[PDB]
Design a protein around this ligand. Sequence first.
Ligand SMILES: *[C@@H]1O[C@H](CO)[C@@H](O)[C@H](O)[C@H]1NC(C)=O
Lengths: 28, 48, 22
Amino acid sequence: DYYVGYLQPRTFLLKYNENGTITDAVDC
Amino acid sequence: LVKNKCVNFNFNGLTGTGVLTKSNKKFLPFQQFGRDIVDTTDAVRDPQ
Amino acid sequence: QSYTNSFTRGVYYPDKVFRSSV
Ligand SMILES: *[C@@H]1O[C@H](CO)[C@@H](O)[C@H](O)[C@H]1NC(C)=O
């Protein structure tokens, strides 16, 4: 019923809306 | 608070000089400052 | 348990700086 994951250092590209909301991300 | 005039401002320990005018940018409720594409603090929110 | 794949989940706001269309 629940999931578990782990994090790693990475470089990401983020898109900010004309509000401030994040709408999409792209991995590198 | 003085608007449309050159003053020295101190917002929550952030100090600078400039002219404070009304804006239309919409922050999110957990955001305090605002920054430009490179380094400058373009916008700021009144704590009160 | 089993093993699956996460499509795109796990994105959070890094800081508290407002940005518009960047
Ligand atoms: C900003 O968000 C509001 C809803 O809170 C919406 O009505 C408005 O069109 C949005 N405009 C943008 C993307 O700047």
